[PDB]
Symmetry: D3
Subunit: 231 residues, 6 copies
């Protein structure tokens, strides 16, 4: 009936992950994968008596890969949103997040609200083809949106004065502000709300299983332990 | 597979509503529909890229209209109950409510408990064919139950002395006690428990979508904003 | 479509229960069944206009009986675990529990953690073929595990010095420590986490109904009332 | 030692109240006092075996009357603030409130934040000599502040176009928006935070008593009962 | 300045206790004292580098002994009430309780509310000179109140048919219903609210210390540990 | 009467701080003070219309300086403990913390509990004369305690193999594990409980004021804002 049965029979759990989003999912020096969600993936696979098989995907290709049935579950710092919910399921959430500006610490007071940010003289930098760009284009009608394809240098462009800010996952803003003390994550009284969860096929029994596993992890304190370790 | 796909393809969301229950659902002077649940309906339709098409229904006809597939979702100050759950699904809840007496303020102390209310000398007035009548007949074995078909004058009958009280949705009792300072909503330490939710077909993917949409509204604070506006 | 419809048509709800686990499920002097979960079962059956038909099962046979479709729901102090979730569904939970040591009160400080317990000189007694034995074998690599088939005398073996402790449901440890003031339930800052819930077939509509019924019981305070009565 | 002893000996509790703030404190047709805080005052006096003696005061005179020892406690919809805390004590709080704009419903979107409100072309109306005026002058450096002494007509000035909005207690904004459907209370995701509490002398034992009384009212559900009745 | 300093200098903490209220305070076979509050007392004394000296008191004499300064703190299953708050302080609370009927299990449905209980044909038994008698006389204007001085046999009188019920601390009702399976503690949706706390002199610094000690016990989980052990 | 009045009259608030505990209190390149608690200190002083005057103190001298009345309040990442509560007051708490091991990440599993840590072959390093040393000596009867006076190099000694771990404030362990990815903060399901608060004189009115100020900061979200900025 269900993918749950298929996974139990094959002894393989195919987990898609991007490897481009520390602390959730990133590449080891040896070319392997590591991170909070890789850790969780190992635990889910083990609960199913299954080998963990990591399937590479990317943000632009995530939903195409989903439709093509390239994986059983995607675990990679993925936000729940209604566009994705059109085609897929999500597990129960494991983290509260949301987009938020990262900007020069010296300019923090200037960029608290969309109204302050959405001005002709402002430049918001974004990476191409993902939810960051969608969020910028949906919420900025006046500010310049600068699309920057090289994610290795994107935050550096803010420091270098090519852009005023980027609006990205709060967890990313926070981490980058550590990598670049020059930068600060804006933190109003919240800027946007979202949750992280695991992307699932439209499969009732498999979702019930994944949710039960994640719920036990959450209530037992295991989830918090791993979050304290990684995040 | 799912009604979710059908709605996404047709670009129409059919929402049933009664238009007889301010603040959830009522008629504008022009003959249109307005209210908290009409507002929410517009937001759900928009999230689906769909036109909102309001389908009239009524309390006596609600479940018949459901069975006849006259709508995709019903949004109209509808309480979750197990009788309806026999045939339909409900979304996650958006409001805690429950039946409660509305009575003369001067008589408030007399009507705190079913035991006090369920006495030969008491008259409880009710509207025909809905959950109010069912609740009265299930909980009053001694008191007189007076069925009154004209909802425009029903609360006036309490003030006029034709009945001692009515047991109805707390939100309605509260509102009517504003319309008629003569009346008070009874508020024990609670009288009955119920939640309001949206009536759904037995459709897993569509329910998951609606719940995700409503959950985001709830956690982001949007739901509270609209409740503060309307309720 | 659903077992929900079948139950509504037949007017019978088949509930499996073990009758070997006071306060959830036990036998009356007359050979009937009683307990918290029998009480709840009566309420669920009544909500469905159905006769309650109790179907005997046992811990070793529970999942076999499930696979054989011997019952509609099992209600018997059953813990949610992922092994069972492989084949079945669970309702939303009604009690937080988890395994915990029961030991001589005089030895309580010695048996707070698995590390203290899992030592060559320690003997943990367990009943055969259930989750207690599985838990012991999964968590004790050094201590002796003593399998004792006679559940009537099993706790007596601790008092009699044949074993140091047993690790069992906290609710059971607590109750037995009342039956035997000689014994104490260990209570660290928690030892293991689990929830009790009702075992369901993979049936979406029936699960939605059961969950709605149980949710109303929980939020209305009925669940707490019955727990205060029995537990 | 304490005013507590003095009140217990004299059998009189002097409670100051303004009588100008329904639902907390207002005047009856006969010239008496009524309201939520008068109700609570009666209960506190009764707990002390004391007569309730209401002592009139006003917002401009409140702290002067306090310094002059004209009362034992003031109960009148009073917000805790640090200016008052310089000289007085407060009981534990009984209501969460805070200032918020009340404006034309048609203009609600324009007045969500101080930044939007504090513009040259905007006029904020306020009553003289209280916390409303202090709040306006502390938070508006550009907008016009219009001082209006006649509290009976002050909200009417907004409707009449003499002012764009007033920033006042949320409970007042809410109530006035009921009196004038023309007006709406602004409700962002919160605009300002404050609590209502009772004004006390610097008297440890008397504060401990009042807090114990109020805590019992809160935890027993009595407080909520009276709030549901009045507010 | 404070009793805190005096206790620190003398190295003695005088704790009053009744020894007539298991599980809080009772007598050992050897004539010593034991119980949850004796345990807590030892911990408070130790934190102060002080010897624990237990001072006997009784319910009728508690406040007289307080006034006579016979002890530093009383720890004995004592409820906070406003009568005691007239003269003494209380620590922050450590347990939520309240009076509740204990009655024959077969009669449980008959005695849910004061209204049902307060009838001419009903007899409520009470022990003399304490809060139980005060509660009965304050809340029963019709029922017979039977004063029974022998606390060893008082619950037996209910079983023996000399009385219908007693209204006493919920923790006591619960325990007695264990001692006498014949009896049940009534548990409405709550009957009365009260908290247990420690009785303190009007001494600010000593109260701040005791509260800090108890707060740490509560937040660290120590309090729950001891409650799980004793209660 | 109170120091509150004295501060209001003098227009000076003397705040003691150590300047040796980033992120709470540290020295700027210019020799000034900075940090979360310096930020909060500025806000408290401003609320009192007072100049902030920072008074240097140190961990060994803190309580001596308190007794000598060298300051009005101490704000410096100070934990509430009962030893300090003997002489001083604390404000309400602003942060939950507690001691926890920091150790090599590779050795994390070995040092989860005091029992594992307190072994002959283990060396715990500590700084002299503070709560870290007191905690080590109170909880380690077998492990070696190595006292290391140079706080600049103390964590380096763990990395260098001179010690296995240090037990220190969780916030410090966390920060140092960032400074030294080589190290990890242990995070069991909690190791020890403590709160941070501000050290106050035994002065009722001043404590009530400080608590009111801090409570407003907490409930308004200001406290969280500053914590998100600094911590
Ligand atoms: Cl770690
Ligand atoms: Cl509005
Ligand atoms: Cl019972
Ligand atoms: Cl009312
Ligand atoms: Cl125990
Ligand atoms: Cl920041
Ligand atoms: Ni770790
Ligand atoms: Ni609005
Ligand atoms: Ni019962
Ligand atoms: Ni009322
Ligand atoms: Ni114990
Ligand atoms: Ni910041």
């Amino acid at each position: 009936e269900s993918r749950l049965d298929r996974i139990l029979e094959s002894g393989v759990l195919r987990v898609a992950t991007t490897g481009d989003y520390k602390p959730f999912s990133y590449r080891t020096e040896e070319g392997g994968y590591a991170g909070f969600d890789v850790d969780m993936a190992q635990r889910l696979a083990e609960s199913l008596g299954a080998k963990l098989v990591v399937v590479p995907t990317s943000w632009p290709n995530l939903m195409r890969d989903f439709a093509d049935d390239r994986f059983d579950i995607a675990m990679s710092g993925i936000s729940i949103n209604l566009e994705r919910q059109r085609q897929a399921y999500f597990s129960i959430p494991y983290l509260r997040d949301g987009k938020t500006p990262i900007t020069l610490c010296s300019e923090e007071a200037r960029f608290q609200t969309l109204e302050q940010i959405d001005q002709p003289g402002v430049t918001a930098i974004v990476n191409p083809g993902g939810t960051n760009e969608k969020f910028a284009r949906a919420n900025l009608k006046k500010a310049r949106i600068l699309v920057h394809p090289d994610n290795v240098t994107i935050f550096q462009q803010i420091v270098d004065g090519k852009a005023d800010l980027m609006m990205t996952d709060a967890i990313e803003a926070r981490l980058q502000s550590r990598l670049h003390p020059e930068l600060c994550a804006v933190h109003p009284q919240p800027f946007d709300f979202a949750e992280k969860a695991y992307l699932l096929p439209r499969d009732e029994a498999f979702k019930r299983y994944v949710d039960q596993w994640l719920h036990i992890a959450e209530q037992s304190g295991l989830l918090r332990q791993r979050m304290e370790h990684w995040l």
